[PDB]
Design a protein around this ligand. Structure first.
Ligand SMILES: CC(C)(O)c1ccc(-c2cccc(N(C[C@]34CC[C@](c5noc(C(C)(C)F)n5)(CC3)CC4)C(=O)[C@H]3C[C@](O)(C(F)(F)F)C3)c2)cc1
Lengths: 11, 225
């Protein structure tokens, strides 16, 4: 789940 | 009895997170042709999911959760958080004589009556409660921080985060509606109706892929389609 983690981890 | 200073900071934090997540006042008023309709719906849904992630991220204690549990909560609450946020707009941001136009427009499009009828029944049902924007923001955070979702390893950790939000909401219900002492019970009662949308949405999704409609990579990821 690439996009979802990106949205969760980004600053 | 009243909200303590800590509860007011917690409420104000959530409200700031909830307001920083807002869809256009251009897309709201404008809300078209037949094939362009299926494109607007795919943008609307993506926008809900983008706003839901941004909001969740900022919820107190969420970043302290196991990475897999965070994904499970997001995946498990997306539909319910989306129907709740649309109810907030439909009853509070948009007037009575405007919601009706949106109902007709969505019906005359592709989407099933099996999907539309419960959707607007929920909007009318939750609209009767005359909920404040603080009530919508807390109920959204409560829906997201549900310990009973599929794949939740640490359930008690999720319950620890949800409990203080339920406390603030219970106090806000008395302070704003002391005439109806059941206002809080009515809000929780509306979550049972909100949980049915998981089944309805899943049906709508199987019809979407066979009617050859496009899905964005984000929608595929959050709903496994
Ligand atoms: C025809 C026509 C002009 O195109 C139009 C007119 C009115 C509407 C309309 C009517 C009532 C509620 C809403 N919803 C709820 C849903 C409604 C459908 C929904 C969705 N369908 O397929 C998907 C996929 C499968 C792509 F994942 N998801 C899921 C929830 C996307 C958004 C909002 O969230 C809107 C109401 C809102 O508050 C605003 F309109 F006021 F902005 C935001 C939209 C739609 C289209």
């Amino acid at each position: 789940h690439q996009l979802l983690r990106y949205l969760l981890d980004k600053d | 009895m009243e909200l303590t200073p800590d509860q007011q900071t917690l409420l104000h934090f959530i409200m700031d997170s909830y307001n920083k997540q807002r869809m256009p006042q251009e897309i709201t008023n404008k809300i078209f042709s037949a094939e362009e309709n299926f494109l607007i719906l795919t943008e609307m849904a993506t926008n809900h999911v983008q706003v839901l992630v941004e909001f969740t991220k900022k919820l107190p204690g969420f970043q302290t959760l196991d990475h897999e549990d965070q994904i499970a909560l997001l995946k498990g609450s997306a539909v319910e958080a989306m129907f709740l946020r649309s109810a907030e707009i439909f009853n509070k941001k948009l007037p009575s004589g405007h919601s009706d136009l949106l109902e007709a427009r969505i019906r005359n499009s592709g989407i099933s009556d099996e999907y539309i009828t419960p959707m607007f029944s929920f909007y009318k049902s939750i609209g009767e409660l005359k909920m404040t924007q603080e009530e919508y923001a807390l109920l959204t955070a409560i829906v997201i921080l549900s310990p009973d979702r599929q794949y939740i390893k640490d359930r008690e950790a999720v319950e620890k985060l949800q409990e203080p939000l339920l406390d603030v909401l219970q106090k806000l219900c008395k302070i704003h509606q002391p005439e109806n002492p059941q206002h809080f019970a009515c809000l929780l009662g509306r979550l049972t109706e909100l949980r049915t949308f998981n089944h309805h949405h899943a049906e709508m999704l199987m019809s979407w892929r066979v009617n050859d409609h496009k899905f964005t990579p984000l929608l595929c990821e959050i709903w496994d389609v």
